[PDB]
Amino acid sequence: KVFGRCELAAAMKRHGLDNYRGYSLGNWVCAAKFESNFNTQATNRNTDGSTDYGILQINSRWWCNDGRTPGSRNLCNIPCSALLSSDITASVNCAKKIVSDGNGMNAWVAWRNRCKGTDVQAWIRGCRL
Protein backbone atom coordinates (compact mmCIF):
# COMPACT_ATOMS: atom_id res chain seq x y z
CA LYS A 1 0.00 0.00 0.00
CA VAL A 2 1.24 3.49 -0.84
CA PHE A 3 0.34 5.80 2.01
CA GLY A 4 -0.56 9.43 1.62
CA ARG A 5 1.66 11.75 3.61
CA CYS A 6 -0.99 12.67 6.13
CA GLU A 7 -2.61 9.23 6.09
CA LEU A 8 0.81 7.86 7.31
CA ALA A 9 1.22 10.73 9.75
CA ALA A 10 -2.07 9.70 11.36
CA ALA A 11 -1.27 5.99 11.41
CA MET A 12 2.11 6.74 12.93
CA LYS A 13 0.55 9.00 15.56
CA ARG A 14 -2.16 6.45 16.40
CA HIS A 15 0.60 3.87 17.02
CA GLY A 16 2.53 6.26 19.35
CA LEU A 17 5.54 7.47 17.32
CA ASP A 18 4.82 11.19 17.77
CA ASN A 19 7.48 12.36 20.20
CA TYR A 20 8.50 8.79 20.81
CA ARG A 21 11.86 9.06 22.58
CA GLY A 22 11.55 12.71 21.65
CA TYR A 23 11.33 12.38 17.88
CA SER A 24 8.44 14.44 16.62
CA LEU A 25 6.11 12.88 14.04
CA GLY A 26 7.55 14.85 11.08
CA ASN A 27 10.80 12.89 11.69
CA TRP A 28 9.01 9.59 11.26
CA VAL A 29 7.19 10.82 8.17
CA CYS A 30 10.32 12.32 6.57
CA ALA A 31 12.19 9.12 7.27
CA ALA A 32 9.39 7.04 5.71
CA LYS A 33 9.36 9.21 2.62
CA PHE A 34 13.04 8.91 1.91
CA GLU A 35 13.26 5.28 2.90
CA SER A 36 10.19 3.66 1.18
CA ASN A 37 8.46 6.64 -0.41
CA PHE A 38 5.55 5.71 1.88
CA ASN A 39 5.13 2.33 0.14
CA THR A 40 4.65 -0.58 2.50
CA GLN A 41 5.77 -3.05 -0.20
CA ALA A 42 9.27 -1.43 -0.61
CA THR A 43 12.28 -3.76 -0.54
CA ASN A 44 15.92 -3.00 -1.17
CA ARG A 45 19.07 -5.07 -1.03
CA ASN A 46 21.93 -3.74 1.00
CA THR A 47 25.50 -4.31 -0.21
CA ASP A 48 25.98 -6.70 2.76
CA GLY A 49 23.27 -8.85 1.20
CA SER A 50 20.79 -8.00 3.95
CA THR A 51 17.45 -6.55 2.74
CA ASP A 52 15.37 -3.65 4.02
CA TYR A 53 11.66 -4.07 4.24
CA GLY A 54 8.63 -1.83 4.48
CA ILE A 55 7.45 1.64 5.22
CA LEU A 56 10.66 2.14 7.34
CA GLN A 57 13.11 -0.09 5.45
CA ILE A 58 13.81 -2.33 8.41
CA ASN A 59 16.66 -4.66 7.69
CA SER A 60 17.11 -8.38 7.84
CA ARG A 61 20.66 -8.03 9.26
CA TRP A 62 19.43 -7.20 12.78
CA TRP A 63 15.67 -6.89 13.06
CA CYS A 64 13.52 -9.38 11.09
CA ASN A 65 14.05 -12.86 9.57
CA ASP A 66 13.90 -13.16 5.77
CA GLY A 67 15.34 -16.66 5.42
CA ARG A 68 18.32 -15.57 3.37
CA THR A 69 20.42 -13.21 5.48
CA PRO A 70 23.27 -15.42 6.76
CA GLY A 71 24.21 -14.76 10.36
CA SER A 72 21.56 -12.14 10.83
CA ARG A 73 19.53 -11.54 13.98
CA ASN A 74 15.82 -11.04 14.25
CA LEU A 75 15.53 -8.77 17.30
CA CYS A 76 11.88 -7.86 16.51
CA ASN A 77 11.02 -11.54 16.18
CA ILE A 78 9.02 -11.31 12.96
CA PRO A 79 9.24 -12.39 9.35
CA CYS A 80 10.46 -9.48 7.31
CA SER A 81 7.40 -10.02 5.12
CA ALA A 82 5.21 -8.85 8.05
CA LEU A 83 6.75 -5.45 7.49
CA LEU A 84 5.23 -5.10 4.02
CA SER A 85 1.65 -5.37 5.16
CA SER A 86 -0.54 -2.33 4.70
CA ASP A 87 -1.03 -2.64 8.43
CA ILE A 88 2.10 -0.86 9.77
CA THR A 89 1.71 -2.20 13.26
CA ALA A 90 4.83 -4.56 13.20
CA SER A 91 7.02 -1.96 11.47
CA VAL A 92 5.98 0.68 13.93
CA ASN A 93 6.66 -1.51 16.93
CA CYS A 94 9.86 -2.84 15.51
CA ALA A 95 10.91 0.82 14.83
CA LYS A 96 10.28 1.61 18.44
CA LYS A 97 12.69 -1.11 19.41
CA ILE A 98 15.30 0.24 16.92
CA VAL A 99 15.02 3.84 17.95
CA SER A 100 15.51 2.88 21.59
CA ASP A 101 18.66 1.10 20.87
CA GLY A 102 21.35 3.80 21.57
CA ASN A 103 21.63 5.62 18.18
CA GLY A 104 18.16 7.02 18.02
CA MET A 105 16.89 7.76 14.53
CA ASN A 106 20.46 7.71 13.18
CA ALA A 107 19.88 3.97 12.55
CA TRP A 108 17.98 5.28 9.54
CA VAL A 109 20.55 6.60 7.03
CA ALA A 110 17.91 8.40 5.05
CA TRP A 111 16.82 10.20 8.16
CA ARG A 112 20.36 11.10 9.10
CA ASN A 113 21.29 12.39 5.64
CA ARG A 114 17.89 13.74 4.58
CA CYS A 115 15.83 14.69 7.59
CA LYS A 116 18.10 15.46 10.52
CA GLY A 117 18.94 19.08 10.83
CA THR A 118 15.95 20.09 8.63
CA ASP A 119 12.51 21.52 9.31
CA VAL A 120 10.86 18.12 9.65
CA GLN A 121 7.56 19.78 10.64
CA ALA A 122 6.95 20.43 6.95
CA TRP A 123 6.36 16.66 6.51
CA ILE A 124 3.05 16.90 8.41
CA ARG A 125 1.99 20.38 7.26
CA GLY A 126 -1.67 20.47 6.38
CA CYS A 127 -2.35 17.20 8.24
CA ARG A 128 -5.27 16.99 10.70
CA LEU A 129 -3.60 15.13 13.51
Question: By what technique were these coordinates determined?
Answer: X-ray
Resolution in angstroms comes to 2.1
35 counts as catalytic: yes
18 counts as catalytic: no
Who's near 87: CB < 8 A, 6+ residues apart?
Answer: none
Q: From the candidates 52, 66, 87, 119, which is the catalytic residue?
A: 52
Q: CA torsion, points 28, 34, 39, 45, in degrees to nearest 10?
A: -120
Maximum distance among all Cα pairs of the chain, rounded to whole angstroms: 44
Please indicate if the annotation marks 101 as binding a ligand. yes
CA distance 111 to 28: 8
Q: What are phi and psi of 106, to 5 degrees?
A: -70, -25
CA distance 73 to 123: 32
Q: What CATH number matches the domain at 1-129, 2.60.40.10, 3.40.50.970, 3.10.310.10, 1.10.530.10?
A: 1.10.530.10
What single string gives the DSSP state of each residue in 19-87? Answer: TBTTB-HHHHHHHHHHHHTTBTT-EEE-TTS-EEETTTTEETTTT-B-S--TT---TT-SBGGGGGSS-
